[PDB]
Design a binder for these strands. Structure first.
Lengths: 124, 262, 180
RNA sequence: UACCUGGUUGAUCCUGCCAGUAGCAUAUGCUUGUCUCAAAGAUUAAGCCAUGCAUGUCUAAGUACGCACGGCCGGUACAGUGAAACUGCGAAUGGCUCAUUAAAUCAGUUAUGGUUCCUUUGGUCGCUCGUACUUGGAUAACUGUGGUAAUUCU
RNA sequence: UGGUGACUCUAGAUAACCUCGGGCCGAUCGCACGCCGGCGGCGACGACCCAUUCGAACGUCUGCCCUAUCAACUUUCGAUGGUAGUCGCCGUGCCUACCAUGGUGACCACGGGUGACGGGGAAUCAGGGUUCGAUUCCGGAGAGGGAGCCUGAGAAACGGCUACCACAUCCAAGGAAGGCAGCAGGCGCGCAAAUUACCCACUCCCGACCCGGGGAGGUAGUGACGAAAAAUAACAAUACAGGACUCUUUCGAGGCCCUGUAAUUGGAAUGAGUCCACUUUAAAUCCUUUAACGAGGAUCCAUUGGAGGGCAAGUCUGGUGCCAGCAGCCGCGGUAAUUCCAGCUCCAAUAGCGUAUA
RNA sequence: CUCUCGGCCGAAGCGUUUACUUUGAAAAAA
């Protein structure tokens, strides 16, 4: 019961449909608290469901008692699926990037440059 | 080069945008529009940097693409649209209204304004010409051309535009004793009464201005914007009243304003 | 093109004559008195004094009703009162020229840990700062040349995770308790 | 921190240079535990280049008869998603280097009343007195037949 | 009618012209659906001309390093000017015809050089100065060397084309294709300089575009270029033929303060490492935060130059004997070397310190 | 420093032309 949450710079975006704030966490003697742990204690603070809130940028200060981050609490899941970056949805299991390397795509791109109409979909 | 530049480096940006050194190589590069690119504030800097609504240069795209932003009453879906002086930014989803006026230190400012004032703006007349079967025109500093003006509008005056219709309602003329704002130079953002206008034919007119405290300054004529008739501003003014404090009393204001705490 | 800053600055000057007795002697007395490590920690505090003398010596040519002298000169004395080097009644711009190296070296965190009695020698303060046993108002400070300001002198203590103030013992006491 | 010191004679005082001294930058030697920033094939050869990548692009809104999928309903012009190709736009920016170049480049200051300007923003766009309830011919993608050792060839 | 400091300006009127290699006056797409066969509302593409924005171009004034073993240059072939035109986006010898004979020069023209791209700046510095500025920002130029074009608003464009000169790849010998002073990488050159790595998440740019792309750019790797912080031990009890403070004339009496060539004892503190986890991030690393282990010759050893003077610090010991060698300079070495080769000891800077050159 | 006008206070002219000095405004960011 030692880990406590305080949110400094609160602001409601009515045009991105979220409440964004700056989260100060005070763990006196433990490690940096995980982002899955703080999303429960913040959801109980703001009376919402922890699949809607998103935390990022947690930097523990020197000495080891405080931790500063950001945080944003959306309105629903569809708004938090439209207005949110894909990498911060991929940490919730909601967006799955494909499995191409960047050099495979440029080779496949520059090989069908050498080929006219419908044999471009054959290549690769 | 061969043909026009499309990038802006960050250190080469205007100083008043207040972009820090270490965020990138490039700065937002305003689109061509009504304002000079040295004299404007792009819409990405007003949303991300000043208002802190967005956090990246993709959220400004996501905000502007919901058509939530009207610049002078027309919806703007370009994030690098140059908003300039006396431009009204209406955000209706939240309910705020801003006007871009300079403050005392040569930058712009977040100046929240009432939606009863947001139906008009002032412009400064820049060239007046006749043509096309004898029909007279204006050209203002927003490139707004308003054909059939009042015959008593001349160059360097100030009109008042209705923003829903585009038409002139009433104007102020260039005279002594009129309240003016400086929109360029080292006295930028300063508000004072026109004292004197010295003519230099074949060169630039110098317009001596007098503060509301007594601080006289001068500018060239092109950095002069008539705001009010007499001493009453026809627009609102920022938190500071266009009166530049010297750095000694600007320090005294801080070291006496911290003593109201507890 | 890069988004990097290459703006750096050296913080010391080496003397013009390298082998000079009674320069060597005086700096060795200042190394031993204040627990410093090498000569470069004296040449660093000689350099910030020479920047303060030089800026006051420039401000003494402008007259008493200059704008720049009245602004920037009052902001120079304010810092020297704030870090506790000057006093408050000596805020003319000519008791700057009476400052010395020892006034600036008495304000390090090392000598203040020794002065408050949290150590028992000037070399015991270096280790107690450097082992992370010393905090200033909330924050563990790990640097001995941390110039203690005047308001942060009343809050220097023993760092609530440490075996000295906090209480959970170290590496050695717990192993000897295991062997008990 | 507005500084000097050894060297000419048996000894002296000078001219005067050599030599030391301190930064700063390129190389280099020996050494190198932690931690934060950070330059980096410029100098000689603006020498020569394997291989790979560095410039592409679709909204409701130019052109869809590819079943390539599937979908009502099967006389329903075109449900939709959409590769391809036509069309539009960009590729003139960014990146790299410093060979040229000495009133040249460039910097500050003015001028275009001696000129062009995609785009953006505003204007203007029944202002002309004289088959339209919609005009004409091709061409890709596609199908099918080929050439050449060989090319983003045709 | 309106203007400027000044128009041969802006408008007005009149007479005509208006290019078939044509000048505008819309045969275009979407979404909601309608009001009394008509009348419709929001957009998307266009579009001559004007204004604006982004520029570009051509000009004005003032300014630059070395050289006189460069003192006269320019003018057939445009050099300076005048007139008429051609061309060109336009002003002009820009170019052509006819004229005039001019134009620059010790106030350094003209010619040559530059280990010359120019600035913003950088090093040093009392004051004055001197030298560097290829290099991330602004401006110029150029894509092996000259030259000519197409397209387009914009290019004399080289990740466009056509030649020629120079190299050079394939070839079935008829032909075909080239351009790293982009990012990597290779060879060569040299005293002299990093990975054929990951990603569009950041900063921004391009496109029909909230969606795609970007060796721009970001992130890592190499990196003692360089700059910042900063460990390699602290403390206590004994003992000293150590010092100091009170007394004893002096011997000598003391936890009063200090010191160590105590490899004397003693626990207390901790990182460097090893390493679960979180955090960081596009995903990782690194640092920050925390488990657990982690120090007694705390072998978990600090080095680079020096000890004659300049100049801090040994005419100690052994070896060599004008040899080997040292030494920036002065000097050292011929059998007692304060100087070489070494051992010990001491000094200076210290995770850094020598050397060479500017 | 003065002449023709506007509400005694502003225009317009100067006086032989400058160098000097002081103020102003204009001078990219880093």
């Amino acid at each position: 019961d030692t880990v406590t949450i305080r949110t400094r710079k609160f602001m409601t975006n009515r045009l991105l449909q979220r409440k964004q704030m700056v989260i100060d966490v005070l763990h006196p003697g433990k490690a940096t608290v995980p982002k899955t742990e703080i999303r429960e204690k913040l959801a109980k603070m703001y009376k919402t469901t922890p699949d809607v809130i998103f935390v990022f940028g947690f930097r523990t200060h020197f000495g080891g008692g405080k931790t500063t981050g950001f945080g944003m609490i959306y309105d629903s899941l569809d708004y938090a699926k439209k207005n949110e970056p894909k990498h911060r949805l991929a940490r919730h299991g909601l967006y799955e990037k494909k499995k191409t390397s960047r050099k495979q795509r440029k080779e496949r791109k520059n090989r069908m440059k050498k080929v006219r109409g419908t044999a471009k979909a054959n290549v690769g | 080069a061969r043909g026009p530049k499309k990038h802006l480096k960050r250190v080469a940006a205007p100083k008043h945008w207040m972009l820090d050194k270490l965020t990138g190589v490039f700065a937002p590069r305003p689109s061509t529009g009504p304002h000079k690119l040295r004299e404007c504030l792009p819409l990405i800097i007003f949303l991300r940097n000043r208002l802190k609504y967005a956090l990246t240069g993709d959220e400004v795209k996501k905000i502007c693409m919901q058509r939530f932003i009207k610049i002078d009453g027309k919806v703007r879906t370009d994030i690098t649209y140059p908003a300039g002086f006396m431009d009204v930014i209406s955000i209706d989803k939240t309910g705020e209204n801003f006007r871009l006026i300079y403050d005392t230190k040569g930058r712009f400012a977040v100046h929240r304004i009432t939606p009863e004032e947001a139906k008009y703006k002032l412009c400064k007349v820049r060239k007046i010409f006749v043509g096309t079967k004898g029909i007279p025109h204006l050209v203002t500093h927003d490139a707004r051309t308003i054909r059939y003006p009042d015959p008593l509008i001349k160059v360097n005056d100030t009109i008042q535009i209705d923003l829903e219709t585009g038409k002139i309602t009433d104007f102020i003329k260039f005279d002594t004793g009129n309240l003016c704002m400086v929109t360029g130079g080292a006295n930028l953002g300063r508000i004072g009464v026109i004292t004197n206008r010295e003519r230099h034919p074949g060169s630039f007119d110098v317009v001596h201005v007098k503060d509301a405290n007594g601080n006289s300054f001068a500018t060239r004529l092109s950095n002069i914007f008539v705001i009010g008739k007499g001493n009453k501003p026809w627009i609102s003014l920022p938190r500071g009243k266009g009166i530049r404090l010297t750095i000694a009393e600007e320090r005294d204001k801080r070291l006496a304003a911290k003593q109201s705490s507890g | 093109p890069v988004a990097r800053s290459w703006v750096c600055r050296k913080t010391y000057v080496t003397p013009r004559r390298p082998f000079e007795k009674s320069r060597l002697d005086q700096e060795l007395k200042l190394i031993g008195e204040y627990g410093l490590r090498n000569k470069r920690e004296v040449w660093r505090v000689k350099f910030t004094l020479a920047k303060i003398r030089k800026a006051a010596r420039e401000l003494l040519t402008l007259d008493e009703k200059d704008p720049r002298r009245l602004f920037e000169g009052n902001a120079l004395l304010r810092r020297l009162v704030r870090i506790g080097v000057l006093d408050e009644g000596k805020m003319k711009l000519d008791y700057i020229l009476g400052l010395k190296i020892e006034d600036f070296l008495e304000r390090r965190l090392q000598t203040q840990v020794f002065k408050l009695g949290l150590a028992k020698s000037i070399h015991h303060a270096r280790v107690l700062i450097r082992q992370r046993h010393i905090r200033v108002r909330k924050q563990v400070v790990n640097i001995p040349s941390f110039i203690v300001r005047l308001d942060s002198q009343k809050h220097i203590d023993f760092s609530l995770r440490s075996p000295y103030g906090g209480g959970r013992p170290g590496r050695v006491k717990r192993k000897n308790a295991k062997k008990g």
